[PDB]
Design an enzyme around this catalytic site. Structure first.
Site, PDB file in Angstrom:
ATOM      1  N   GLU A  42       0.847  -1.201   0.000  1.00 46.71           N
ATOM      2  CA  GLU A  42       0.000   0.000   0.000  1.00 46.71           C
ATOM      3  C   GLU A  42       0.879   1.246   0.000  1.00 46.71           C
ATOM      4  O   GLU A  42       1.445   1.594   1.032  1.00 46.71           O
ATOM      5  CB  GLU A  42      -0.977  -0.033   1.198  1.00 46.71           C
ATOM      6  CG  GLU A  42      -1.757   1.244   1.481  1.00 46.71           C
ATOM      7  CD  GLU A  42      -2.685   1.128   2.678  1.00 46.71           C
ATOM      8  OE1 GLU A  42      -3.263   0.045   2.888  1.00 46.71           O
ATOM      9  OE2 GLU A  42      -2.836   2.125   3.437  1.00 46.71           O
ATOM     10  N   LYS A 131     -11.196  -0.986   5.911  1.00 43.48           N
ATOM     11  CA  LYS A 131     -10.052  -0.588   6.721  1.00 43.48           C
ATOM     12  C   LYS A 131     -10.574  -0.257   8.151  1.00 43.48           C
ATOM     13  O   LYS A 131     -11.429   0.620   8.328  1.00 43.48           O
ATOM     14  CB  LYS A 131      -9.305   0.613   6.072  1.00 43.48           C
ATOM     15  CG  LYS A 131      -8.234   1.280   6.974  1.00 43.48           C
ATOM     16  CD  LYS A 131      -6.811   0.980   6.558  1.00 43.48           C
ATOM     17  CE  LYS A 131      -6.587  -0.541   6.391  1.00 43.48           C
ATOM     18  NZ  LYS A 131      -5.190  -1.037   6.502  1.00 43.48           N
TER      19      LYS A 131
END
Length: 205
Positions: A42, A131
């Site tokens: 990420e 998330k």
């Protein structure tokens, strides 16, 4: 690319959340982490020329790295990320304009939530993989508590994941863990070894 991406997270179990002060630093960190067994990377948009970092990591993409964009706070960033070849998009919060844009572009978006009401709002925009952020505050117990009411939601926390708690996180029912400085901070030799050590801990549980 949702069910492909879901199975990718399920298979690979750890996302490296890269913060870096430069393109060069990000790229060698991404590399070191991949060399250590971490396939999900990420690239945070706090990184300068994050879009360019992603583009230039296509050599790693060829190795089987799944590279996406993190800390996306605007559709502008998202457009750039996607254009650069981000395979997934992560934000700290829920952004409905980014949601729409990613639906439109067929891009997997993982929005951040911290509460049940936030979670429900995320679900109603089509998101079941969320998330959890910050995981230091909404820890393994939050994941476990959401299982009952929201059985189809799957969390990938960032914040509050280390070697000593990662297994507790999986016991609680996470799909994967995002890990920042505990993994990516230091020299490429050390990052590579931490990555190795993380992948091994998770395989262990």
């Amino acid at each position: 690319h949702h069910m492909k991406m879901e199975e990718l997270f399920k298979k690979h179990k750890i996302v490296a959340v890269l913060r870096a002060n430069s393109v060069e630093e990000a790229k060698e960190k991404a590399l070191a982490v991949f060399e250590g067994g971490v396939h999900l990377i990420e690239i945070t948009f706090t990184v300068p020329d994050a879009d360019t970092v992603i583009k230039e990591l296509s050599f790693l993409k060829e190795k089987g790295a799944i590279i996406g964009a993190g800390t996306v706070t605007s559709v502008e960033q998202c457009r750039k990320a996607v254009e650069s070849g981000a395979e997934f998009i992560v934000s700290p919060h829920l952004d409905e304009e980014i949601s729409q844009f990613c639906k439109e572009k067929g891009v997997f978006y993982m929005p951040g939530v911290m509460t049940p009401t936030e979670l429900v709002k995320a679900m109603k925009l089509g998101h079941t993989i969320l998330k959890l952020f910050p995981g230091e505050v909404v820890g393994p117990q939050f994941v476990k508590a959401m299982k009952g009411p929201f059985p189809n939601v799957k969390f990938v926390p960032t914040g509050g994941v280390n070697l000593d708690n990662v297994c507790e996180w999986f016991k609680a029912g996470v799909l994967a863990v995002g890990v920042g400085s505990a993994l990516v901070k230091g020299t490429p030799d050390e990052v590579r070894e931490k990555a190795k050590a993380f992948v091994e801990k998770i395989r262990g549980c």
